[PDB]
RNA sequence: UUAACCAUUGUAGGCCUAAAAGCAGCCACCAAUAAAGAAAGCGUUCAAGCUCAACAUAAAAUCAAUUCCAUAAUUUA
């Protein structure tokens, strides 16, 4: 069973959100964090990362990870930790063209996240759509 | 981290914020291919904006077709 | 089912029933369910051979058989 | 028509009955209209009914027959009336494994719209203007040609 | 009654997408899809890129009309059912063959070398 | 349109929410893929995960005719 989580690499044992949820299906929690910790060393600590762990009936771990979230990074780029109540029209940060594009190039490196598209228009829409989800307006230039 | 608008717009501070990746400077706009800055920066392509003969037109129209059924499904 | 063998000739006239039934046999979920089965696909009238350890050999031809019967026949056979 | 012979099983497509050539009413989209039988058959015409019925009395699918829904309901109703009337001795139900008839007397019936099993008795007939009506025939067969001076009385 | 009476392209773009790819690729190796996921199909496309082949696919219900409005009208037997389309413009028989080796369970119907109906075994024999 | 099958990835997207990821609230409402609803009923410590919609569509079935109290009956113009 594929379980999707966004836990930050810095904390390999968040507790309730991962420990018991995976344990309910029946797994070794300590084993999960160690393999997750292996990703943590390779990746920057303290940044949310999407995971694609598969919990098989055999009580084995198949941990698959990708590039860190653009959504939280956009929040960090906009200097926003906690956004506005709605964020549909509330905006606290503006992102120009260049910042939008540097990150899109980096994004096009992982198998997951459908980052094999030849056109970069695929990448912009996700981050633009992600920005719309956040309390951020992607203005052309400020 | 960077806290200068000039450095923000003249140096790639957001491209990498890891420890192994050091903030790299921005090359000139001409130093990158034209398609990099020609990507769609406007709002999501609407049925009018989408070309009737574009795959996104039908795919988004298919998404719209799901929306109407979903609206019906929610009421049930 | 220890082994499942499906044979059909695309170059000659190929019956749809066997091919449609073949896709179900060559399915990731189906293969996992009957993990014991060894999936072998023969491509060159069509003949499908299914072998059981108990000695029951079940061979299916789709020329005059609908896919529904083939799936039903195997499904009961697999349960044993 | 495919028949399965049976472990290894073999299915052979066998000869299927062919419609007689020269339909009386060519240009008929539905087989019943092709033969000008739209409103001139009844449950008593078992010969026609048997063609559309399973060997044990089950209904054949409309798609295979290809006839229109209006006749399908009429034909299905006619077969039900004939079956309930014991007019289809060769299409009697298949006994599950080795069962035998209940051996109780079977009442002779015809023009039976509904199963006799599921019809409750009518204790109170009613007075002059409260008389209860007895259903005879089926509404599906209303359009059938009538040779009487006045339209047939469905309610008896 | 109407049933008794005497007898009395929406998808349009998807032509262009399929028309472009097939016209480019003379021989199409046809293998039935094993209920594969979208992400895997992209991965297999890169796997074919190792083989210099492309998994360019679209709803197969429009694949049957492709022959109706395209360069050829006689490849319908090739595209029978829901199947992965291996479209190759070069006669690299070995590259096509090892595509089959990548997934044993998945069946390869064959390759229409020069847009001529053929089987997998025939494809290899003729391609040789 | 709706009868039969199938269901990937971005992103657990931001929001007081411990956490709410389509599915507590709350947002605006896009992308990739052949085909995916920033979600429709389910499931909800929260999610995974069930289906409905995605791609495929099957194949069905504009209203009727205190104690009963003649007996009955659908076709000869
Ligand atoms: S008799 Fe013509 S529609 Fe059936």
Residue E13 with chain B: CB contacts under 8 Å = 53-55, 57-58
Residue A116 CA, chain-centre distance (Å), reads 17
> What is the rounded CA–CA span in Å between residue A60 and residue A54?
8
Kindly list the strands in the beta sheet with A51-55, ordered across the sheet, starting from the edge strand earlier in the chain.
A2-5, A51-55, A61-62
E1 lines ligand 1 (CB under 6 A): yes
Containing A132, the helix (H) or strand (E) segment is helix A121-133
Nucleotide F68's nearest residue (CA vs C1') is: D124
Asked whether strand F has any atom less than 7 Å from the CB of D147, the reply is: yes
> What is the rounded CA–CA span in Å between residue A124 and residue A74?
13
Which three-class secondary structure state does DSSP give residue D137? coil
Q: What does DSSP assign to residue B20?
A: S
Q: With contact defined as beta carbons under 8 Å apart, do E55 and E109 qualify?
A: no
The maximal CA–CA distance of chain E, rounded, in angstroms, is 62
- Long-range contacts of range D109-112, CB-CB < 8 Å, 24 or more positions apart? D109/D84, D109/D85, D110/D43, D110/D81, D110/D85, D111/D43, D111/D81, D111/D85, D111/D136, D111/D137, D112/D80, D112/D81, D112/D84, D112/D85
Query: Closest Cα partner for A8 from A75, A85, A100, A108?
Result: A75
Entry resolution in angstroms? 7.3
Q: With contact defined as beta carbons under 8 Å apart, do A18 and A32 qualify?
A: yes
> What is the rounded CA–CA span in Å between residue E6 and residue D26?
9
Q: With contact defined as beta carbons under 8 Å apart, do E33 and E106 qualify?
A: yes
Sign, Cα dihedral of C30, C32, C37, C43:
positive
* Ramachandran sector of residue C46 (left: φ over 0; alpha: ψ -120 to 50; beta: rest): beta
Query: Closest Cα partner for A83 from A134, A13, A133?
Result: A134
Residue A29 Cα distances to A48, A61, A63, B47, angstroms: 19, 10, 13, 48
> What is the rounded CA–CA span in Å between residue B22 and residue B24?
6
Say whether residue A119 is in contact with chain E using an 8 A CB cutoff. Answer: no
Calculate how close chain C gets to E52, using CA atoms only, in Å.
24
Phi/psi for E96 (5° steps) reads -65, -40
> What is the rounded CA–CA span in Å between residue C2 and residue C36?
5
Which three-class secondary structure state does DSSP give residue D62? helix
Q: How many CA atoms lie within 13 A of D96 on its CB side?
A: 1
Length of chain B: 76
- Long-range contacts of range B58-64, CB-CB < 8 Å, 24 or more positions apart? B58/E11, B58/E13, B58/E14
For chain D residues 82-111, those near strand F by a CB cutoff of 7 A are: 111
Q: How many CA atoms lie within 13 A of D116 on its CB side?
A: 12
> What is the rounded CA–CA span in Å between residue C14 and residue C20?
11
Q: With contact defined as beta carbons under 8 Å apart, do C26 and E105 qualify?
A: yes
Axis-axis angle for helices C16-25, C67-79 (nearest 10): 30
> What is the rounded CA–CA span in Å between residue A107 and residue B15?
10
Number of C to D CB contacts under 8 A, please give it. 22
Please choose from D24, D27, D33 the residue to mutate so as to test ligand 1's pocket, defined by most ligand atoms within 8 A of CB. D33
Query: Closest chain D residue to E2 measured between Cα atoms?
Result: D29
Q: What is the CB neighbour count within 10 angstroms for residue D26?
A: 8
Q: Which residues contact A18 (CB under 8 A, 6 or more apart)?
A: A5, A7, A29, A32
* Mutation target vs D (from C5, C58, C62, C65; most D CBs, 10 A cutoff): C65
Q: Which residues contact D145 (CB under 8 A, 6 or more apart)?
A: D39, D40
Containing E50, the helix (H) or strand (E) segment is helix E38-50
Adjacent-strand bridge partners of E27:
E88
Amino acid B73 CA to nucleotide F22 C1' distance, rounded Å: 14
The strand pair at C3-8 and C47-51 is best described as antiparallel
- Per DSSP, the residues of C1-61 read --EEEEEE-SSS---HHHHHHHHHHT-HHHHHHTTT-EEEEEE---EEEEE-TTS-EEEE-
Q: Which residues contact D86 (CB under 8 A, 6 or more apart)?
A: D106, D108, D109
Phi/psi for A64 (5° steps) reads -125, 130
Asked whether strand F has any atom less than 7 Å from the CB of A125, the reply is: yes
| Experimental technique of record | cryo-EM
Q: With contact defined as beta carbons under 8 Å apart, do E118 and E126 qualify?
A: yes
Query: Closest Cα partner for A44 from A69, A25, A23?
Result: A69
Q: With contact defined as beta carbons under 8 Å apart, do C3 and C40 qualify?
A: yes
Positions on chain F within 7 A of a protein C-beta: 6-16, 18-19, 21, 26-41, 45-49, 52-57, 59-61, 64-65, 68-77
């Amino acid at each position: 069973g594929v379980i999707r989580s966004i836990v930050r690499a810095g904390q390999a044992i968040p507790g309730p959100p991962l420990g018991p949820i995976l344990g309910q299906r029946g797994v070794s929690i300590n084993q999960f964090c160690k393999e997750f910790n292996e990703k943590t060393k390779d990746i920057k600590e303290g940044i949310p990362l999407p995971t694609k762990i598969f919990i098989k009936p055999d009580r084995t771990f198949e941990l698959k990870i990708g590039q860190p979230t653009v959504s939280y990074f956009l929040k960090a780029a906009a200097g926003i930790e906690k956004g506005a109540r709605h964020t549909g029209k509330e905006v606290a940060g503006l992102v120009s063209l260049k910042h939008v594009y540097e990150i899109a190039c980096v994004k096009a490196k992982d198998d997951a996240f459908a980052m094999q598209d030849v056109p970069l228009s695929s990448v912009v829409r996700s981050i633009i759509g992600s920005a719309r989800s956040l309390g951020i307006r992607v203005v052309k230039d400020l | 981290v960077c806290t200068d608008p000039t450095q923000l717009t003249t140096h790639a501070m957001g491209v990498n914020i890891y420890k192994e990746g050091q903030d790299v400077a921005l090359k000139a706009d001409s130093e990158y291919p034209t398609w990099l800055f020609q990507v769609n920066l406007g709002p999501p392509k609407k049925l009018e904006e989408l070309e009737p003969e574009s795959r996104e037109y039908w795919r988004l129209l298919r998404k719209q077709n799901i929306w109407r059924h979903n609206r019906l499904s929610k009421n049930k | 089912v220890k082994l499942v063998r499906v044979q059909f000739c695309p170059f000659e006239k190929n019956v749809e029933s066997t091919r449609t039934f073949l896709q179900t046999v060559s399915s990731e979920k189906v293969r996992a369910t009957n993990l014991n089965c060894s999936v072998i696909a023969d491509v060159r009238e069509p003949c499908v051979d299914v072998l059981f350890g108990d000695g029951y050999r079940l061979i299916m031809r789709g020329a005059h058989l609908t896919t529904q019967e083939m799936l039903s026949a195997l499904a009961s056979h697999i349960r044993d | 028509l495919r028949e399965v012979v049976k472990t290894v099983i073999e299915g052979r497509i066998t000869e299927t009955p062919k419609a007689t050539p020269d339909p009386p009413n060519p240009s008929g989209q539905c087989p019943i209209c092709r033969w000008n039988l739209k409103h001139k058959y009844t449950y008593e015409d078992v010969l026609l009914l048997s063609q559309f019925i399973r060997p044990y009395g089950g209904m054949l699918p409309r798609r295979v027959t290809g006839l229109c829904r209006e006749e399908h309901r009429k034909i299905e109703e006619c077969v039900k009336m004939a079956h309930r009337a014991g007019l289809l001795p060769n299409h009697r139900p298949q006994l599950p494994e080795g069962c035998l008839p209940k051996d109780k007397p079977k009442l002779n019936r015809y023009l039976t719209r509904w199963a006799p099993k599921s019809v409750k008795p009518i204790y109170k007939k009613g007075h002059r203007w409260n008389k209860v009506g007895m259903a005879v025939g089926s509404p599906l067969l209303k359009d059938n040609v009538c040779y009487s001076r006045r339209p047939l009385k469905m309610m008896h | 009654n109407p049933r008794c009476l005497p007898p009395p392209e929406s998808v349009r773009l998807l032509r262009q997408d399929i028309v472009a790819v097939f016209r480019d690729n003379r021989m199409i190796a046809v293998c039935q899809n094993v209920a594969l996921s979208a992400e895997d199909k992209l991965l297999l496309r890169h796997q074919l890129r190792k083989h210099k082949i492309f998994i360019k696919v679209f709803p197969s219900q429009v694949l049957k009309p492709f022959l109706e409005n395209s360069k050829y009208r006689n490849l319908l037997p090739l595209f029978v059912g829901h199947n992965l389309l291996l479209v190759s413009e070069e006669p690299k028989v070995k590259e096509m063959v090892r595509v089959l080796k990548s997934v044993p369970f998945l069946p390869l119907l064959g390759g229409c070398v020069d847009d001529t109906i053929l089987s997998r075994q025939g494809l290899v024999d003729y391609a040789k």
